[PDB]
Design a protein around this nucleic acid. Structure first.
Lengths: 83, 98, 105, 94, 97, 78, 104, 91
DNA sequence: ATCAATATCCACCTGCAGATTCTACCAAAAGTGTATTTGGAAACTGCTCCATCAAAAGGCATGTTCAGCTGAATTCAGCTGAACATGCCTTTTGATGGAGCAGTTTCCAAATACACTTTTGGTAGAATCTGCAGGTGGATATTGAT
DNA sequence: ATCAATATCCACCTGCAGATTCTACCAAAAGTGTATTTGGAAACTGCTCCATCAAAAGGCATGTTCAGCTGAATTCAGCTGAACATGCCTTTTGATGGAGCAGTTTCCAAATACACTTTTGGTAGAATCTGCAGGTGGATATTGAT
């Protein structure tokens, strides 16, 4: 089945919740689009590297270690999945 | 009826979501987004459940930290509403786009 | 037969750290004191975190450390925060912190 | 099959030393395992670089030593270097 | 008499020092500062001439980039004058604090 | 000694940085940041000198030290 | 009859191989790896020298100085990405005044 | 004491046979070659370890270039590299 | 707008000296030929673990209304920081010349690799305790209107 | 300065999902006996590095005057938060096929290990040369004023 326009599933209320945990009280209306912008560039960058590991291992399944190595490369070191 | 003034529930929510550690983006929509972004890179590849969970932990983590920095940029401009101008400054100083 | 960990008085495996130093391609040869010294530094830092995390667990009235308590221990200690400044603790949350400017005047 | 190692046996040992009443969830054990592996890598590779800058084919406890000095913020470094030297002298008393 | 309006010579200075690549801190006060700081970690240390020049290249570069980010914080707060809060915000966002 | 970094030089640094107007409190704040910088870099560079059992900080010590801090510098050895 | 000539390169493939074996990167070094790598280093060097030579021409000069190199790195997008955390000694900054700061 | 000096001068004479290069600028090119070498070599090392491989091959160097170079710089790099390896094993 | 009078910028040519480039012979690589050793490509294959489905239910997302109060836009003056002309001194050269000291060899003792042959400590998967998650209702603050 | 209107404490209860313990294996750490190389330990140069020393020229410190920028104080259209009513779609749960990860072997092709042979890149003096730096002369940019 075809996958399209999926960044729109990052709901406006969920972007609000992320901003709350961030400590933000008032949120201008354009933020929700700006946030999705940033989020996509983040995921692209990470998934791109993550898949370069999957391809180098000649595999078809993106493993959690692939993501962990990828985040490490981007200086976003993640604990709690790493082995 | 009753009515809380603009800002009171805002602060109620900051207090609430800062006390928690649950993920704030819905699992299925995030998973769809991730599979699309991956699909438009390599074709018919699988995902370990843990790798989508790693992507989501890292992504919510990233965005929440960006909101902290965004908020300080808004305060610094004597405002309380975060705007795109603020995010673009926060990222610019971080090096992420400059 | 005595394990090198007990010879050095450690709970961490000195044999395993020594094996991980050769298989990791860090140096052509590995001296005999390096795995001991290193296993000691790792055991120390593990202890130093576990201390503060157990404390944070007791404060929340819990008997088992969850990732939150680990995040609390890392983020309230200045030096562990410096050491884990670019590290993200999954299921860890943030520290409660509301900017003063935003509070009910 | 196939068996995969971790530091959980030792992290649990040190946990029952500092807080003998508390236990640790597996998600937090994974976070700890991640931390030991991260710091292992940081130390071993900074030491690798030390031995290479000085044209020495061998990483000794001295390389590990200044690696810790370089890499750990103070006081954590002081206390670390202390327990490390302690364990290495005690070791070489056969 | 003749006189330039406030703001004009400032832009003339920006156009000049962005055109140049010379170091902008006087060499000797810097050297004194470096050995004064190093004395606090190891005593009676000598320095390769290349190392004082490297330390100065590196630190002046650091400060110019910090001033760029600072200037942007000044602008962002509807100002034109950089203040200590601008430097403090720039460093806080960079991770230095 | 730190007061030896004169204001006309901190002025020039902000000029190269693109700064038009400068608060008077800047110069003290600048000397502070610069001190934390040399402090961190030199502490590392000297740790490299001591490890090499030397008495002279070599330019390569400063370079390796700057790399550790993510301030990679070209033109002095690497 | 060398290896660099066999690969049609100017960079030392033999020396790159020796630096890889001696660098403590892996137990064994494949035979094609040092070739491949020396090729990537030569290419990137060419790309920079090209753009910096144009900065030298454009500045009416014959000898490439650090300034021309920094102009070449920062005015080009992708080399800027690649050396974003690198400081080019004696390099200066790119002329850039924020519009907000301009007369009238 | 070694350097990359004569090789940078050679490649300079290919692209710009008319122009020459300052000494400080040659040092900068040297630092650049050493840096890129280090980044690529160590990324390739990690590739090998992550997959429990014992040898660094051109396959690893390649995936290293993909990860490290912002393609399009990477596209041309991978080209220049496979090209030089193909010509090497021909002869 | 320009008219005028500062001062600033900008080429065009200039001549010398600090560096560049080019020559001229030597150890340390690097290429070569042969012999061993082996890392991981190739080929089945057990078998987790992933994609996908169905179904039901209630947790949240969507959209709409209404207005509190925030952000923007404005006016205004005190005052801070720029431009300068002034006056003095600290930085900058420039060898000079002695000396700490980073770099070199050369024995060889101590430390490490290494090749095998036992001897466990660790790990996977049963089995067996036990927090605490996620309901529940009181007491306690906290808000916000009158 | 009151009371309602709600939110947010907290403490208490209790089976179940996620620990903790209890187990045989067996991979790998440990013990021992040679073989290799390691990186100090004295012995001696040559560098670069400190250190005075001693003019000139800058480039800094400092005062004075005010242009204009930063903060403050207002005003107000309207954006964004709070509350709702609706009903969609995410979640939860449990089942099944099968792709493809990952444990085994098997066996060449490709790597390592010597051992000499051969070439190249680095040095340190010899033969150029680009560009700094300084010199007018002419448009340029800036800021006063009918």
């Amino acid at each position: 089945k075809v996958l399209r326009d999926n960044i729109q599933g990052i709901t406006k209320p969920a972007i609000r919740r992320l901003a709350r945990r961030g400590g933000v009280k008032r949120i201008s209306g354009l933020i929700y689009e700006e946030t999705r912008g940033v989020l996509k560039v983040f995921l692209e960058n990470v998934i791109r590297d993550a898949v370069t590991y999957t391809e180098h291992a000649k595999r078809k399944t993106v493993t959690a270690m692939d993501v962990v190595y990828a985040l490490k490369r981007q200086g976003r070191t993640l604990y709690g999945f790493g082995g | 009826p009753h009515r809380y003034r603009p800002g009171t529930v805002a602060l109620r929510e900051i207090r609430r979501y800062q006390k928690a550690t649950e993920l704030l983006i819905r699992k299925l929509p995030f998973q769809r987004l991730v599979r699309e972004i991956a699909q438009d890179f390599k074709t018919d590849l699988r995902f370990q459940s843990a790798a989508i969970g790693a992507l989501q932990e890292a992504s919510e983590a990233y965005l929440v930290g960006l909101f902290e920095d965004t908020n300080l940029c808004a305060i610094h401009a004597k405002r309380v509403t975060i705007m795109p101008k603020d995010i673009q400054l926060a990222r610019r100083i971080r090096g992420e786009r400059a | 037969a005595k394990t090198r960990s007990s010879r050095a008085g450690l709970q961490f495996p000195v044999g395993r750290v020594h094996r991980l130093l050769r298989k990791g391609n860090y140096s052509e040869r590995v001296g005999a004191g390096a795995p001991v010294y290193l296993a000691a530094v790792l055991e120390y830092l593990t202890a130093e975190i576990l201390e503060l995390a157990g404390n944070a667990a007791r404060d929340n009235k819990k008997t088992r450390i969850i990732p939150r308590h680990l995040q609390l221990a890392i983020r309230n200690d200045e030096e562990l925060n410096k050491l884990l400044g670019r590290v993200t603790i999954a299921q860890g949350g943030v520290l409660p912190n509301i900017q003063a400017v935003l509070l009910p005047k | 099959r196939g068996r995969k190692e971790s530091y959980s046996i030792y992290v649990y040992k040190v946990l029952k030393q500092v807080h003998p009443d508390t236990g640790i969830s597996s998600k937090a054990m994974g976070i700890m395992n991640s931390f030991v592996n991260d710091i292992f890598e940081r130390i071993a590779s900074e030491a690798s670089r030390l031995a290479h800058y000085n044209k020495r084919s061998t990483i000794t406890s001295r390389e590990v030593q200044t690696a810790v000095r370089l890499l750990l913020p103070g006081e954590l470094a002081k206390h670390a270097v202390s327990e490390g030297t302690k364990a290495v002298t005690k070791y070489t008393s056969s």
